[PDB]
Design a protein around this ligand. Sequence first.
Ligand SMILES: O=C(O)[C@H]1CNCC(O)(O)[C@@H]1O
Length: 451
Amino acid sequence: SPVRVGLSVDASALGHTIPPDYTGLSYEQAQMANPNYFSGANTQLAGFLRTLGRQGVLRIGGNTSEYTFWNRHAKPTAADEHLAAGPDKGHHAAAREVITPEAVNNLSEFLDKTGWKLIYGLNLGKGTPENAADEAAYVMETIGADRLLAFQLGNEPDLFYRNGIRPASYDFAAYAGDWQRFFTAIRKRVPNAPFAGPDTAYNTKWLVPFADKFKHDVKFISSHYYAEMTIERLMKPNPRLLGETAGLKQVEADTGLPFRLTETNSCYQGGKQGVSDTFAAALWAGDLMYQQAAAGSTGINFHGGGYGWYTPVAGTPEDGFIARPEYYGMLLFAQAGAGQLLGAKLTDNSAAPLLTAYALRGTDGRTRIALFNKNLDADVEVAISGVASPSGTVLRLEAPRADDTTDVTFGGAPVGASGSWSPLVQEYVPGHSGQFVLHMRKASGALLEFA
Ligand SMILES: O=C(O)[C@H]1CNCC(O)(O)[C@@H]1O
């Protein structure tokens, strides 16, 4: 007994344009202590990034960016030649790590194998303005202007008052004083240096005051989002999401600087075993990419590394890399590709309320629809109107249970080594122009492409 829902596509209801560099990943700065990780020799990880997008952004930052120190004469230690730095769990201070010129040289070679651009964290929490300027000069020289999208001056500065990085009295005004001092030092050595911020954890009250004070000094505004957890809770809206969406919309409405979600994943403190590492996270992540794009976001960076519960890609240079379940929701987005969002209204859906749908006119002119049946107990039958085409094909995003940590496929295939992926099962959509009908099992996703 599927829940019978209507989906009306309205090509006259033009939404936001999704740019080619929308997709992205975030890693801990501590990983730059291992020059083998972001390296030309890491062909496996480079292939996972290429499969997520021809263009995209690598963001390096996180809690460890306050505990990582640039040393222009240093070489890496024994332990850090083998370091796989997973997401910081945010319980206490991270271990001190050193970043070497060799690590920045190898990062350039890595980025050049991918086509991706870089957002690079500087140490405003514990470092000096002069050391930041020295690091920025080396990064700008080596990575180059076309691949360096932005420096960010600290990670989650809105938590320095609580985590001991600053006094209890630290507030936006104190942060703006620190930010101006680092900005001035860096621009003295790197007059072309680009910036973004404030890279906040959650405090939306900082976004527009940052944008207004530093309007002539930044390329875009950035903030973070974590949904925390149970799988049922992850499939629903929550107040924190509503607040972050409202913050993004205030930036777009009050400034005309673009916004990027520079660090996001399902559950903070490194994720939750049984939620973040499950097929549910693929549906959560693919739905999030579209919801934020529909709300006016220019891009996203899913946090990860090591074998963290929420990482899209898990592994090490020594042991190899694998796509975790969340990767498959980002792979649906990659396959849908860039374009402009169209209206897509669901009706008769109160029985299947966690079903989401997004329509897109691709750069090639063809209509695509991304659906996420996030209902854990309801199959749906989707009557699709407003789409004119002889023919459509469906790629399904599936696992046998929402809590599965494996068995995830897209287009009837898993991702293989080095991000290898091609569709092996493609089905025609039942119906004809102006009336297509699509069945979806409970807890599943679909990408429809029309001729
Ligand atoms: O708590 C987490 O999972 C995140 C929160 N944001 C900072 C971080 O990326 O360093 C951390 O790993």
